[PDB]
């Protein structure tokens, strides 16, 4: 069985005092065993050492991005080998905000995934379609093309988790049902089975990166092809613990 | 007189052990007084708290970039208000690598400068032309356009330092003379006098961001319109101290 996976993307949020309170609340949390849930939290770069040094050892830390290749003459970027030096085990790559606002192409994201895995990082690789893409009938064309650019560059999927972001439901007045989430996760898994292998399809976690809260987390988590969540704003709040508890 | 200014851009370099050795070497350095040189060092984001907590109090810390506007839903970015929370006083904006490789436009850089200054950061704003631009006769057209996009958005220059990067001499086999540096710095200062004010032209440091080493730092620093340096790779090395000593 695929181990349920809950990632918390803090995005570009936090002060030293807020980070201490978030970490304390996570450290005091009582959640399902390590055997049935894997928990990753993702602070901004400036808080990676602080969170790694203070967070309970059974929760894991992710960076929110990294650079595409070996560091040295890229002002402002953080290399995969720098994250490995700091003992940060995970990285989020291809988040919808970076694809749309910073124009990260599918091939650029795929090159980042390959380089991060080569350096020993575990990767949350994000895919997802816009409302214009969904309304054009292009959901699976887009999600397959994004996934293919990663798959063409990945020789081992053990340390990859795919996150589906329903960008079409993010600030549009459109809402995604559990059935709509399940349909995309099923079709993406079927794509992996045909384009990579049956074994990779069966073993790769595909997590939901839409609106997740205490209200909806059990119905979403219980879908056949949903293996957990990439949480946004609730990741800063005690509600994140209720979302982890969907693994029960 | 304009106070000589030496910035060290570490770029995407460093391990925890290397950072400790760099900071120790800076802490043991014996350099000109605070009255005649201002020293700023710029680690990667993940080392900002470590360097700020351990560096001598008379040297200052810069981030290598920040986001264009208020933080909250920009995965992977670091906001100006986050740097202010961490008591990081400086930021480098518009570095040539970000303009060229990450396609930061002149207007985007100008919006970043304005937002950083509004939040209370001090800014090293970078400009510079490529070899193709220089060979087309476009040096001052390019440098003026880059500067204008910042000037159009800046209402106070007290906390701005401009860095000129001779991108045309960076990995091309072309070399920049002290006379060539002086010519651009003079023409840029003359542009500031006409387009902003005589007072801003007279008081704004314009630092040289080309190849700076112990060999060339005194001849470059002694040019009439060169007010210091934005150092690249030497910033990681004990040679950075020899470059600071050009202020004598
Ligand atoms: Na499920
Ligand atoms: Na000078």
Swiss-Prot record, chains A, B:
Q: Report the top EC class in one word.
A: isomerase
**What's the main place this protein lives?**
cytoplasm
Q: Which reaction does it catalyse?
A: D-glyceraldehyde 3-phosphate = dihydroxyacetone phosphate
Alphabetical keyword list: Cytoplasm, Gluconeogenesis, Glycolysis, Isomerase, Mitochondrion, Phosphoprotein
Q: Which GO terms describe its biological process?
A: gluconeogenesis; glycolytic process; response to zinc ion
- One Pfam family from the record: TIM
Q: Which residues carry this modification: Phosphothreonine?
A: 130
Got any disulfides in this one, which pairs? none
Q: Where does substrate bind?
A: 9, 11
SUPFAM superfamilies, per this entry?
Triosephosphate isomerase (TIM) (SSF51351)
Protein name listed in UniProt: Triosephosphate isomerase, cytosolic
**Source organism per UniProt:** Arabidopsis thaliana (Mouse-ear cress)
Quote the gene name from the UniProt entry. CTIMC
